[PDB]
Design a protein around this motif. Sequence first.
Motif, PDB file in Angstrom:
ATOM      1  N   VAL C 331      45.304  -8.713   2.907  1.00  0.00           N
ATOM      2  CA  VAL C 331      45.205  -9.814   3.879  1.00  0.00           C
ATOM      3  C   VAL C 331      44.401  -9.377   5.094  1.00  0.00           C
ATOM      4  O   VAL C 331      44.264  -8.170   5.348  1.00  0.00           O
ATOM      5  CB  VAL C 331      46.588 -10.351   4.319  1.00  0.00           C
ATOM      6  CG1 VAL C 331      47.316 -11.035   3.159  1.00  0.00           C
ATOM      7  CG2 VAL C 331      47.438  -9.246   4.946  1.00  0.00           C
ATOM      8  N   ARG C 332      43.884 -10.363   5.835  1.00  0.00           N
ATOM      9  CA  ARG C 332      43.204 -10.084   7.107  1.00  0.00           C
ATOM     10  C   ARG C 332      44.089  -9.177   7.968  1.00  0.00           C
ATOM     11  O   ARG C 332      45.297  -9.433   8.123  1.00  0.00           O
ATOM     12  CB  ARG C 332      42.906 -11.384   7.838  1.00  0.00           C
ATOM     13  CG  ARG C 332      42.119 -11.167   9.133  1.00  0.00           C
ATOM     14  CD  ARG C 332      41.938 -12.495   9.834  1.00  0.00           C
ATOM     15  NE  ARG C 332      41.293 -12.403  11.147  1.00  0.00           N
ATOM     16  CZ  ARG C 332      40.077 -12.856  11.422  1.00  0.00           C
ATOM     17  NH1 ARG C 332      39.305 -13.389  10.493  1.00  0.00           N
ATOM     18  NH2 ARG C 332      39.633 -12.791  12.671  1.00  0.00           N
ATOM     19  N   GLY C 333      43.494  -8.120   8.522  1.00  0.00           N
ATOM     20  CA  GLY C 333      44.249  -7.178   9.347  1.00  0.00           C
ATOM     21  C   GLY C 333      44.521  -5.846   8.657  1.00  0.00           C
ATOM     22  O   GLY C 333      44.980  -4.906   9.317  1.00  0.00           O
ATOM     23  N   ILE C 334      44.264  -5.774   7.347  1.00  0.00           N
ATOM     24  CA  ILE C 334      44.398  -4.536   6.594  1.00  0.00           C
ATOM     25  C   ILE C 334      43.064  -4.266   5.916  1.00  0.00           C
ATOM     26  O   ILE C 334      42.356  -5.194   5.582  1.00  0.00           O
ATOM     27  CB  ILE C 334      45.463  -4.668   5.479  1.00  0.00           C
ATOM     28  CG1 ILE C 334      46.724  -5.385   5.954  1.00  0.00           C
ATOM     29  CG2 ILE C 334      45.789  -3.310   4.853  1.00  0.00           C
ATOM     30  CD1 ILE C 334      47.570  -4.594   6.922  1.00  0.00           C
ATOM     31  N   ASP C 335      42.700  -2.999   5.749  1.00  0.00           N
ATOM     32  CA  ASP C 335      41.505  -2.672   4.955  1.00  0.00           C
ATOM     33  C   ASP C 335      41.718  -1.394   4.161  1.00  0.00           C
ATOM     34  O   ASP C 335      42.676  -0.645   4.382  1.00  0.00           O
ATOM     35  CB  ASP C 335      40.234  -2.569   5.836  1.00  0.00           C
ATOM     36  CG  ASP C 335      38.939  -2.669   5.042  1.00  0.00           C
ATOM     37  OD1 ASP C 335      38.950  -3.047   3.837  1.00  0.00           O
ATOM     38  OD2 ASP C 335      37.880  -2.346   5.617  1.00  0.00           O
ATOM     39  N   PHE C 336      40.808  -1.158   3.228  1.00  0.00           N
ATOM     40  CA  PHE C 336      40.818   0.051   2.419  1.00  0.00           C
ATOM     41  C   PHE C 336      40.207   1.245   3.132  1.00  0.00           C
ATOM     42  O   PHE C 336      39.577   1.126   4.186  1.00  0.00           O
ATOM     43  CB  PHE C 336      40.073  -0.228   1.118  1.00  0.00           C
ATOM     44  CG  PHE C 336      40.533  -1.500   0.429  1.00  0.00           C
ATOM     45  CD1 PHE C 336      41.828  -1.615  -0.097  1.00  0.00           C
ATOM     46  CD2 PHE C 336      39.663  -2.571   0.281  1.00  0.00           C
ATOM     47  CE1 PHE C 336      42.240  -2.792  -0.727  1.00  0.00           C
ATOM     48  CE2 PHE C 336      40.061  -3.751  -0.335  1.00  0.00           C
ATOM     49  CZ  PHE C 336      41.351  -3.862  -0.845  1.00  0.00           C
ATOM     50  N   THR C 337      40.438   2.420   2.550  1.00  0.00           N
ATOM     51  CA  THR C 337      39.656   3.596   2.871  1.00  0.00           C
ATOM     52  C   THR C 337      38.947   4.097   1.619  1.00  0.00           C
ATOM     53  O   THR C 337      39.220   3.669   0.478  1.00  0.00           O
ATOM     54  CB  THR C 337      40.530   4.750   3.396  1.00  0.00           C
ATOM     55  OG1 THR C 337      41.383   5.243   2.352  1.00  0.00           O
ATOM     56  CG2 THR C 337      41.310   4.361   4.683  1.00  0.00           C
ATOM     57  N   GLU C 338      38.069   5.060   1.848  1.00  0.00           N
ATOM     58  CA  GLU C 338      37.233   5.680   0.838  1.00  0.00           C
ATOM     59  C   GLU C 338      37.979   6.764   0.049  1.00  0.00           C
ATOM     60  O   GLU C 338      37.375   7.661  -0.502  1.00  0.00           O
ATOM     61  CB  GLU C 338      36.004   6.285   1.536  1.00  0.00           C
ATOM     62  CG  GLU C 338      35.096   5.271   2.243  1.00  0.00           C
ATOM     63  CD  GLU C 338      35.600   4.702   3.579  1.00  0.00           C
ATOM     64  OE1 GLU C 338      36.635   5.143   4.173  1.00  0.00           O
ATOM     65  OE2 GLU C 338      34.918   3.769   4.043  1.00  0.00           O
ATOM     66  N   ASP C 339      39.301   6.665  -0.037  1.00  0.00           N
ATOM     67  CA  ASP C 339      40.100   7.549  -0.902  1.00  0.00           C
ATOM     68  C   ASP C 339      39.691   7.220  -2.367  1.00  0.00           C
ATOM     69  O   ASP C 339      39.836   6.059  -2.794  1.00  0.00           O
ATOM     70  CB  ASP C 339      41.577   7.229  -0.587  1.00  0.00           C
ATOM     71  CG  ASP C 339      42.579   7.828  -1.549  1.00  0.00           C
ATOM     72  OD1 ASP C 339      42.288   7.948  -2.749  1.00  0.00           O
ATOM     73  OD2 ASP C 339      43.742   8.058  -1.123  1.00  0.00           O
ATOM     74  N   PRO C 340      39.121   8.187  -3.125  1.00  0.00           N
ATOM     75  CA  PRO C 340      38.566   7.826  -4.453  1.00  0.00           C
ATOM     76  C   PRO C 340      39.619   7.428  -5.472  1.00  0.00           C
ATOM     77  O   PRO C 340      39.271   6.890  -6.534  1.00  0.00           O
ATOM     78  CB  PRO C 340      37.842   9.110  -4.918  1.00  0.00           C
ATOM     79  CG  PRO C 340      37.631   9.874  -3.677  1.00  0.00           C
ATOM     80  CD  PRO C 340      38.801   9.585  -2.774  1.00  0.00           C
ATOM     81  N   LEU C 341      40.879   7.725  -5.189  1.00  0.00           N
ATOM     82  CA  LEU C 341      41.970   7.259  -6.025  1.00  0.00           C
ATOM     83  C   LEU C 341      42.229   5.771  -5.765  1.00  0.00           C
ATOM     84  O   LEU C 341      42.284   4.957  -6.698  1.00  0.00           O
ATOM     85  CB  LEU C 341      43.202   8.142  -5.766  1.00  0.00           C
ATOM     86  CG  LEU C 341      44.385   7.944  -6.707  1.00  0.00           C
ATOM     87  CD1 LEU C 341      44.067   8.515  -8.093  1.00  0.00           C
ATOM     88  CD2 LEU C 341      45.601   8.647  -6.135  1.00  0.00           C
ATOM     89  N   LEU C 342      42.352   5.405  -4.489  1.00  0.00           N
ATOM     90  CA  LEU C 342      42.518   4.005  -4.114  1.00  0.00           C
ATOM     91  C   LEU C 342      41.352   3.128  -4.589  1.00  0.00           C
ATOM     92  O   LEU C 342      41.539   2.036  -5.123  1.00  0.00           O
ATOM     93  CB  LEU C 342      42.678   3.905  -2.581  1.00  0.00           C
ATOM     94  CG  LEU C 342      42.665   2.487  -1.978  1.00  0.00           C
ATOM     95  CD1 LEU C 342      43.794   1.617  -2.534  1.00  0.00           C
ATOM     96  CD2 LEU C 342      42.740   2.579  -0.450  1.00  0.00           C
ATOM     97  N   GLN C 343      40.141   3.631  -4.384  1.00  0.00           N
ATOM     98  CA  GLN C 343      38.926   2.877  -4.682  1.00  0.00           C
ATOM     99  C   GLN C 343      38.943   2.392  -6.143  1.00  0.00           C
ATOM    100  O   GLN C 343      38.629   1.235  -6.432  1.00  0.00           O
ATOM    101  CB  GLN C 343      37.708   3.776  -4.406  1.00  0.00           C
ATOM    102  CG  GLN C 343      37.473   4.036  -2.921  1.00  0.00           C
ATOM    103  CD  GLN C 343      36.695   2.904  -2.300  1.00  0.00           C
ATOM    104  OE1 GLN C 343      35.650   2.530  -2.825  1.00  0.00           O
ATOM    105  NE2 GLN C 343      37.189   2.345  -1.182  1.00  0.00           N
ATOM    106  N   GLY C 344      39.316   3.275  -7.072  1.00  0.00           N
ATOM    107  CA  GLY C 344      39.322   2.885  -8.492  1.00  0.00           C
ATOM    108  C   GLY C 344      40.500   1.998  -8.887  1.00  0.00           C
ATOM    109  O   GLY C 344      40.387   1.178  -9.815  1.00  0.00           O
ATOM    110  N   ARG C 345      41.635   2.176  -8.210  1.00  0.00           N
ATOM    111  CA  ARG C 345      42.791   1.292  -8.431  1.00  0.00           C
ATOM    112  C   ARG C 345      42.379  -0.141  -8.254  1.00  0.00           C
ATOM    113  O   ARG C 345      42.850  -1.016  -8.990  1.00  0.00           O
ATOM    114  CB  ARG C 345      43.958   1.608  -7.487  1.00  0.00           C
ATOM    115  CG  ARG C 345      44.654   2.901  -7.855  1.00  0.00           C
ATOM    116  CD  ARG C 345      45.771   3.230  -6.877  1.00  0.00           C
ATOM    117  NE  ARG C 345      46.946   2.387  -7.081  1.00  0.00           N
ATOM    118  CZ  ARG C 345      47.861   2.145  -6.140  1.00  0.00           C
ATOM    119  NH1 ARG C 345      47.719   2.625  -4.893  1.00  0.00           N
ATOM    120  NH2 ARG C 345      48.911   1.381  -6.399  1.00  0.00           N
ATOM    121  N   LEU C 346      41.507  -0.410  -7.283  1.00  0.00           N
ATOM    122  CA  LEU C 346      41.173  -1.806  -7.016  1.00  0.00           C
ATOM    123  C   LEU C 346      40.638  -2.512  -8.277  1.00  0.00           C
ATOM    124  O   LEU C 346      40.970  -3.671  -8.538  1.00  0.00           O
ATOM    125  CB  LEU C 346      40.223  -1.934  -5.825  1.00  0.00           C
ATOM    126  CG  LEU C 346      40.816  -1.370  -4.524  1.00  0.00           C
ATOM    127  CD1 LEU C 346      39.769  -1.372  -3.421  1.00  0.00           C
ATOM    128  CD2 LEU C 346      42.063  -2.108  -4.083  1.00  0.00           C
TER     129      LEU C 346
END
Lengths: 318, 671, 673
Positions: C331-346
């Motif tokens: 939601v508006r107010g939260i964002d991702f980081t460049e953690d390569p584990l998180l990035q692929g989860r998306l």
Amino acid sequence: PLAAYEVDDSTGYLTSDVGGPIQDQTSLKAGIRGPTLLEDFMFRQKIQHFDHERVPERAVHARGAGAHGTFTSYADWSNITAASFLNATGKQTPVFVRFSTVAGSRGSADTARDVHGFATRFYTDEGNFDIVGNNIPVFFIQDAIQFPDLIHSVKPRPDNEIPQAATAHDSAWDFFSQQPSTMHTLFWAMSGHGIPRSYRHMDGFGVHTFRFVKDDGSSKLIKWHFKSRQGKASLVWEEAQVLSGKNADFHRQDLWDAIESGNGPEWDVCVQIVDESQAQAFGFDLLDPTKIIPEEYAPLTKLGLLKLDRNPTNYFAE
Amino acid sequence: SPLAAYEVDDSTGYLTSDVGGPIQDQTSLKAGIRGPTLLEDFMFRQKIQHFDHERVPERAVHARGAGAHGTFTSYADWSNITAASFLNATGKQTPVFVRFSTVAGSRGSADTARDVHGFATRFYTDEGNFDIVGNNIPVFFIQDAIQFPDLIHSVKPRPDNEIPQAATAHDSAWDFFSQQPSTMHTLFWAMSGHGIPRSYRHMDGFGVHTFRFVKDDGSSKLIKWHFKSRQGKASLVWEEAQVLSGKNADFHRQDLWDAIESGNGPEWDVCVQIVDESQAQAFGFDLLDPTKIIPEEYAPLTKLGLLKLDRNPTNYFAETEQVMFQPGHIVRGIDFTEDPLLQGRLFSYLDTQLNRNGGPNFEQLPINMPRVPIHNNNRDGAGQMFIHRNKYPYTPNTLNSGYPRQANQNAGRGFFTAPGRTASGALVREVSPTFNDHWSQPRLFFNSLTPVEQQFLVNAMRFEISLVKSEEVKKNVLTQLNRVSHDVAVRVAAAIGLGAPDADDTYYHNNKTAGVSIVGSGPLPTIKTLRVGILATTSESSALDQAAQLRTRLEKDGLVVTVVAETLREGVDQTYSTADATGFDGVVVVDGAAALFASSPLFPTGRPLQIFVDAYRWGKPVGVCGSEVLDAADVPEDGDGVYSEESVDMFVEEFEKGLATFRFTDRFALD
Amino acid sequence: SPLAAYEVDDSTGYLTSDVGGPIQDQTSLKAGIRGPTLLEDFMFRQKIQHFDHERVPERAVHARGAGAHGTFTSYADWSNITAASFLNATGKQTPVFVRFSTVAGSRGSADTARDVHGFATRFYTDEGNFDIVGNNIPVFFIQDAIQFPDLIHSVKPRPDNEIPQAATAHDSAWDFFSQQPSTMHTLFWAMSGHGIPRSYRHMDGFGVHTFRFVKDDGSSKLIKWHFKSRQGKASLVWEEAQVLSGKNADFHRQDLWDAIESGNGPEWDVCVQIVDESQAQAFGFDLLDPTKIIPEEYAPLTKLGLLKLDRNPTNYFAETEQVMFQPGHIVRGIDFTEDPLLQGRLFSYLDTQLNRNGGPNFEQLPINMPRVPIHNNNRDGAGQMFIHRNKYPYTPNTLNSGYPRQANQNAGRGFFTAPGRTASGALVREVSPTFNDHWSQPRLFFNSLTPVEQQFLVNAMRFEISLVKSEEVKKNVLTQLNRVSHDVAVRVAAAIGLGAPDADDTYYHNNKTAGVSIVGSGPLPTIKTLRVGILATTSESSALDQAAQLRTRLEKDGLVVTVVAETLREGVDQTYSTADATGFDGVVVVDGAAALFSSPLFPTGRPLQIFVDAYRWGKPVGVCGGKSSEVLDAADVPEDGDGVYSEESVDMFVEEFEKGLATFRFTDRFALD
Ligand code: HDD
Ligand code: HDD
Ligand code: HDD
Ligand SMILES: [Ca+2]
Ligand SMILES: [Ca+2]
Ligand SMILES: [Ca+2]
Ligand SMILES: [Ca+2]
Ligand SMILES: [Ca+2]
Ligand SMILES: [Ca+2]
């Protein structure tokens, strides 16, 4: 090239899918004028298969036809690309090509006015390589995220599903006039390129700038252009309209017949090659798929010959 | 209505994801302004994933079709013949959805292909959904459901090249027809004008099979369903249908849409023939045999109620594409018969919806939902949209107090099998000898057509069989046709340069039956919705004035008027470039436009004259309002359905009679 | 229920088909009373087709789990740190659904397997669904999402024979851990009591990745999510977990169900650690690396609000099985980081729902729908439940007046990427060298455990590694363990008959961090819901009277009491035959039952075994009534032992026993190296 998967039924007794000999012409019934039995497995396996024959049509390019052939390299192109299928004079690679329209569903007419697909698979000795191209060198839109917008606007209006295989309706022209990137492809589609005489009489284009990469890691920017050896030809519109009614299968029949008569169509597989430094040198951006590189700025280099010379055995399977 | 509850309005508001987060959808997220697209762009991937998965498998047959909503109203309390609740009171109204279709073509094929047509009706009754899944032809090609893939493989495109689309005009189809003589009756119907109806509104619907009406007392009678069009019967001619296929593949769906939008929703009398169980073999054929009609001379029609279609869908995919009909959708008061074609259909329609929907909860789609509560122990499955409160979904139970309760003849208005039905004999894969006469009824049908109608049928067969490459198949076709009529075989053989086999009179007879001829069914009962093309010119103000005068009059009479000229302007609907005779049921030239019929960059050479000439050739009423035009078109001024008046009122009166006549058949050559 | 509109009631009425026709479903239609079944029996086929198609693919990981509904309440207006609407006012409430899970086991595997656990939370916010798809351990095994199938193939059963279920105790898993040293930190957590939590209510939740909080003005901070249990931290001991897996595979889902039904819905403080963007590499490791925690000594927790689960599902399949979480639900107010584990989860969570649901309209299932309107141009697809009125679903349009309108930072409260984010450099498939220290934090974690807790962890490793058949894999495991702690390697090696390699002190240190120890976390803050088994006998009316008095006194304080005897009767809940020490947090024998401590009614020695097992596993145990020597002597339990109770007075007994329940485990009963 797919001989190992072929199934011959020119002889023999009918079997189930598990090899049990059976019949399939009369249902099993409780008496000669009786109700059909649930234990009739012959009935149910045959009808279940029939009931499940269909698969979703492609989201775009649903209407199309294909053939097998061969690509032959004209040279060792190692000095511009590490690609194995291009690494020796005379090197041959099997191909399969599918041609198509874009908007119409299955069963729509070949001779609708449209952009056409020209998709080529090279079954190379270092993996399958596909060039998924069109007969027009530029695309309507500049960002993939807009594709559903373009396609919803050109496909039939979604309340009534009218009109089939046509841009001649309000939504398509609303989109074209609100999204000016569409002008280049629009002019192409409104020319004779929107109604080619046959798949054999059109060219193929990768549209995008790609890269050729040498084993040393250096790269050049390329555009793919498959140049027809049959020449360029179009229908006239009034002729295309009549053909859509008299022979919806006109292009697929033309291709089938040319191959069966030993007149398999040919294209020179070509590239324009330019330096990375020329990405913005020609007065437009090479990352922009609405732009061509004029041939006056970068000539075509002929890489090899694409020839289609064998029709499929089973249209669905292939 | 489930359909109202699920309507989504997007006339206002900011774009959101499917989970309600406001987003944008016009530019990808990139690493720099000229950089690569990021995997973390969820806006891109949700939108493109949806797009990538929009399509579902087309129907295995009847893929090409169109639908509408309406109402069925009962004429009476029919308790004396059936327990069916939707038929239990005078004036009782039940919502309906109807889909019309061709059979062989894929979902983008032309409406005006020559084919059998579907006419499928859902009655959303107060005791469950009841579907009558019918066709516009009362008899079917085959006598056992197990043969359906054989029939359909043979008529669909050849499977090496997928040629030809939406056509029986190829070797395999005629190979099957000539080897499987049961096909003769439906084949004759399909080769008549019934194969190319003028619209979905100008065709009838038939259940085909004998069914049962069952009373609450358990007694039963045998019935055939016949939906009789209140618009009349009408066909295209073949050459017109071919041109139409190219000029407007959406002709029938457009016609239906437009009739409904204009307040001219089509109507049918829903009727039955009703006969006693003891008459199953009394009419000289077996009522279990779906290749046979009951001639109306043996059993008249009883009108049960009125079917009217009067509302178009909101979303074609959600409603028309996803409607999933089943003859298994039956209600108390109706039962099956032992027709082996019907028997196997029951299996197919439940199974095939798994392919279309991709999961087992297809009855939860809004268009498939009933309009009464559902109480059962079906659970889970992909796409489960319910949250069931009953945690003990098994019978018998005490932990849910025995609910849901079993429904049967004596409880809960249950469906019940007609209790007089029995079976006796060996368990057999054998065809009843009572099904063996494949030729007498095709001959009955042929005999009942008018001379020009017989010619059209012969000409349809000449057309298709001439495209069959195999000499052997062609000879086998003549063998079968000859068993129906020697004259048909002789006349067809003449076109293909073969000799017809000698007469075989086993099944020949001279009997006729009422209600099967299109040409003989008289003038149309209404001309509302029929299309008049007025060919005018922008070059003469008088021409546009004449056209406007004609329009005013014709439109008050419910006709759809198109004024055609070189270019658009006030009062002009269509350019010559986009106009074609297939777009009109009648064509009028205003006399100020005469010069166009004698070159322009605005339309193809000779287009104005070609429209008039085509309309004439295809049997339409044609006229000039206000000699030279008729001379150029080689149209005889004294011809039936040719009009020439200076008086607009006189012209309109005469031309309107012509529209009701609909086709002037004296313009076609006969053997 | 928040999903009341979708509920179907079957408490009255006659059976119908799915299209409302009344039918029966108990006998097939046959040609004669002893005849074959008819194809025309549509009642049969619709019922059996539904049954035949009931199953859907289990989740690729976290297949075993259970869920509940609840509410999140914000403690403040957090606009100072985030634009997120659900956090924008004191007392603002948002409905939630939470699913807890193991990772490796299939459906029907045991809750009490040793594993990482999932803790997935959906907030049905007024600006869209927001999911935090977390675990009970704050660090992950791997540093790049592309390695997930490698990790999961290695821990799941061997693919020739599909053995072993729900266990890392096999060669392939330890082969992977020893070849991929990033695994060490999560491995140490999983081998601690965090791998065998006492319940879902007694574990914390972690988002694992660094995320961003983004203000409406576009500025951003880096955050870690930590849901801190209000019930306390508690674990099983391993032997107890093994017995529980057999005696009650549903232990955790039952515990959650029951806590909610009794009005003891579990709670967590939803917290964040908040740090500046400039601190991405300031703590001695990279905040993009999901194998690292930020020690609390460096960044304290800020409590954002209260998460309470208080309503069980109505239909498990429809709600718990079908809930489809995604970290892409942002939601508006939260964002991702460049953690390569998180990035692929998306990518993964959007794609995998196609497998589960069989079609693209999975967000339309009631449990996945948002609680606000949807306006977009998505269409069609199998299972389309909407009837869209807008017949011009493309942008840009004029024919629908330009609706839906684009939403972005400046209009319509759109999501927006944190505008300070940049990228620079070559397009590379290379690991950042900042990710390379795989051993210091595992050692930090180990150092922070108490001595008996370190022993339990060593013993878990001794158990699992002794089951590895390959001597090369075992040697490779010791090589990695030794880089974390020479002492761990020596003690593990001792059980498996190998020598530990020589100390390698590169990553050794003595630093500790707060809040990761279970044993050191102190007494539980509440004993409500804890289970007391009272062992009695029907032989003595006095024993049943004692048990009834104790029940009354214990129930007053919210304990769940089970009276066990040879046979059931009023006041007795369970027979000895079905009773086990794993069913209780504390065990009391009433002294009237002392004689029990052979019969056709239970296995030989069962009453005593319950008491002895409870004692061995560290639980409070006691004898109520005044006469304790006979029972305690038979059990070899010392009468002066910590967590051993004996009193005549029911009041005095319960007061002491309740202190023992809060202590929860008496760790003095376990031997140390
Ligand atoms: C983001 C979505 C998207 C975008 C921007 C494009 N396409 Fe595409 N295309 C698809 C999404 C897609 C698809 C939905 O993925 C299809 C449907 C069937 C398939 O395999 O992929 C497809 C099919 C498809 C086919 C049919 C292949 C076949 O015969 O099976 C061709 C020839 C093209 N496309 C060519 C193009 C060209 C030349 C494009 C612009 C340069 C282009 N597409 C842009
Ligand atoms: C044993 C197989 C079989 C047989 C013998 C028939 N059909 Fe059928 N029919 C199907 C198997 C099928 C099917 C494959 O199950 C379809 C495809 C889509 C669907 O829902 O059912 C179908 C579709 C379908 C439709 C389209 C419904 C719609 O608009 O969605 C109509 C109108 C009919 N059929 C009518 C008939 C008639 C009048 C038949 C003979 C009296 C007949 N069918 C025999
Ligand atoms: C690239 C693949 C991938 C990676 C690296 C991860 N996961 Fe995941 N996760 C999935 C791919 C996945 C999945 C295959 O997409 C699942 C299966 C079911 C689902 O909805 O998503 C899943 C399910 C899933 C569930 C179950 C949700 C539910 O109860 O339905 C939880 C709690 C997590 N994961 C948590 C994590 C955490 C805390 C990770 C590391 C920080 C993590 N996952 C990394
Ligand atoms: Ca439109
Ligand atoms: Ca041209
Ligand atoms: Ca053929
Ligand atoms: Ca006719
Ligand atoms: Ca293994
Ligand atoms: Ca943004």
